[PDB]
Design a protein around this ligand. Structure first.
Ligand SMILES: *[C@@H]1O[C@H](CO)[C@@H](O)[C@H](O)[C@H]1NC(C)=O
Ligand SMILES: *[C@@H]1O[C@H](CO)[C@@H](O)[C@H](O)[C@H]1NC(C)=O
Ligand SMILES: *[C@@H]1O[C@H](CO)[C@@H](O)[C@H](O)[C@H]1NC(C)=O
Lengths: 212, 118, 214
């Protein structure tokens, strides 16, 4: 299958630099032009850069021209985006995409946050089931930057799960909760564990959520 | 992707009537030139475009004689023709880029000319 | 450059309804237009390429039509998992291959009252020095809902924040969390913590409460 694996994103100070990578597989890389598209919070999709199959032609949106450089290494089947002189308006999820036209395959996206704030890992607290259906959860509090991922029972529990969008607190740190509704009968037998991961700080917490 | 019947280089002398830089796509599928776009590049500049959707050709002033035979485009022939005055002043690598909706491709051809000493 | 005018900005349509979204190009671009579906914070997926070709793997309920300047994306019979922001994109090589503004497609459904739950702060959090009280409004429709916090019957303000999920892929409902944040000391001063919920689906507001020491 086609895969576009991104890396190199994350937190960067205003005026700083980052180099995004996109490891391609499952298609003849050198036969296709490749692109970068971004999406700033609460905004539409913005095409930002493209490069022909050989690398001989490059294209840029006016918003990034002079600061970003697209390149590719056909021997490694990898696409790059060198981003210099970053600004708060460059904060967005960046995607690599196959082609420069109909983007048939896309990378997973990597959040680039242009901020002078420090990385902070979250604390994970249980939201215990209390008094036919019971609700339980996990509170992922005080982290920066985004994102955090939350799963239940290592991915085995997906039904009735609601992982809320993170909210930016007055302190400038994010917080989110992930809840799940399960039958009250299973509370004494079935075990419920929330798996929290915060890659920007290398925090991995597995919190067990029990009644009482 | 679009595939080509490639040629590394072509040479002309003042014995040639017209200068022809070949470009042949072997897998064109469009039945209408509206869906086709052709672009010839030289030293990183666009020196000829045929825009099928506008049915319009565009050349800069230094390639005033450059053209393709549009009647041959659906057969995959996107060869560039020009006079010797434009050709002698622009020797080197040309890129023929053809687009047919989501299918695209490019090929490079070197245009050669040798100054005869007497 | 070529500008795309995508319409409408948003729409709400029932399961089984036809959804129609349009895009007008500022220049004639023959079939050089694509359509995408994007779920929040996820990569877009190509639906239609070259104005009217269905991408392989895309369900047959999606179709595109048009050539020149006027394009249309249609969902013949809407399924609840089709909520997303849809985008057209110009791809004619004469200009940058940019996206339209997007159309947010929401699923219209009947009124659903929320199920309300309340969670006191954990002992682990209290030992760390802070207290977060969470009120959960589960599976309601429409999105409009009012949450009022009361601590020992006193109305609260400025000390809570809300978060709302996207529509559920099956029942098209929303869920909402309202988190009341207090210092450990302030939390320990009071006994009764209650969240009062007002919603179109409830004939009278519903209050869920707890007593701190229990
Ligand atoms: C010049 O003429 C020769 C002989 O007909 C031909 O083989 C060659 O392709 C021509 N060169 C160009 C650049 O047209
Ligand atoms: C395209 O332009 C050429 C040159 O002006 C003209 O002869 C031809 O009829 C045009 N084709 C169409 C379909 O209008
Ligand atoms: C054209 O390209 C070939 C292959 O890369 C190279 O050997 C040659 O020197 C180039 N010609 C010019 C004039 O740059």
């Amino acid at each position: 299958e086609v895969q576009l694996l991104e890396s190199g994103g994350g937190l960067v100070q205003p005026g700083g630099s980052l180099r995004l990578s996109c490891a391609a597989s499952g298609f003849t890389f050198s036969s296709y032009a490749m692109s970068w598209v971004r999406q700033a919070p609460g905004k539409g999709l913005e095409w930002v850069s493209a490069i022909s199959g050989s690398g001989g032609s490059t294209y840029y949106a006016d918003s990034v021209k002079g600061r970003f450089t697209i390149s590719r290494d056909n021997s490694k089947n990898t696409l790059y985006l060198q981003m210099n002189s970053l600004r708060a308006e460059d904060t967005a999820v960046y995607y690599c995409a196959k082609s420069y036209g109909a983007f048939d395959y896309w990378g997973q996206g990597t959040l680039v946050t242009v901020s002078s704030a420090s990385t902070k890992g979250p604390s994970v607290f249980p939201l215990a089931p209390s008094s036919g259906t019971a609700a339980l959860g996990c509170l992922v509090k005080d982290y920066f930057p985004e994102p955090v991922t939350v799963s239940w029972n290592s991915g085995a529990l997906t039904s009735g799960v609601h992982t809320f969008p993170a909210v930016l607190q007055s302190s400038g740190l994010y917080s989110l909760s992930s809840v799940v509704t399960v039958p009250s009968s299973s509370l004494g037998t079935q075990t419920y564990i929330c798996n929290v991961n915060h890659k920007p700080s290398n925090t991995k917490v597995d919190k067990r959520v029990e009644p009482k | 992707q679009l595939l080509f019947n490639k040629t590394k280089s072509v040479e002309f002398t003042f014995g040639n009537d017209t200068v022809v830089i070949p470009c042949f796509v072997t897998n064109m599928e469009a039945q209408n030139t509206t869906e086709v776009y052709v672009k010839w590049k030289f030293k990183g500049r666009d020196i000829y475009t045929f825009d099928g959707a506008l049915n319009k050709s565009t050349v800069p002033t230094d390639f005033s004689s450059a053209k393709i035979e549009v009647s041959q485009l659906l057969k995959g022939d996107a060869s560039l023709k020009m006079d010797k005055s434009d050709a002698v002043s622009h020797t080197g690598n040309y890129t023929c880029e053809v687009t047919e909706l989501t299918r695209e491709g490019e090929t490079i051809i070197e245009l050669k000319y040798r100054v005869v000493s007497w | 450059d070529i500008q795309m005018t995508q319409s409408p900005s948003s729409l709400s349509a029932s399961v089984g309804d036809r959804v129609t979204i349009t895009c007008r190009a500022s220049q004639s671009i023959s079939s050089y237009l694509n359509w995408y579906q994007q779920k929040p914070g996820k990569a877009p997926k190509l639906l239609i390429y070259a104005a009217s070709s269905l991408q392989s793997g895309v369900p047959s309920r999606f179709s595109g039509s048009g050539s020149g300047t006027d394009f249309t994306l249609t969902i013949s019979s809407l399924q609840p998992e089709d909520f997303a922001t849809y985008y057209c994109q110009q791809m004619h090589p004469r200009a940058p291959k940019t996206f339209g503004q997007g159309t947010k497609v929401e699923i219209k459904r009947t009124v659903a009252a929320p199920s309300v739950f309340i969670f006191p702060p954990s002992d682990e959090q209290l030992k760390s020095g802070t207290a977060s009280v969470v009120c959960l409004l589960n599976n309601f429709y429409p999105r409009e809902a009012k949450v009022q916090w009361k601590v020992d019957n006193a109305l609260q303000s400025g000390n809570s924040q809300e978060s709302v999920t996207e529509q559920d892929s099956k029942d098209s409902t929303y869920s909402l969390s309202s988190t009341l944040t207090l210092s450990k000391a302030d939390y320990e001063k009071h006994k009764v913590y209650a969240c009062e919920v007002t919603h179109q689906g409830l004939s009278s507001p519903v209050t869920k409460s707890f007593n701190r020491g229990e």
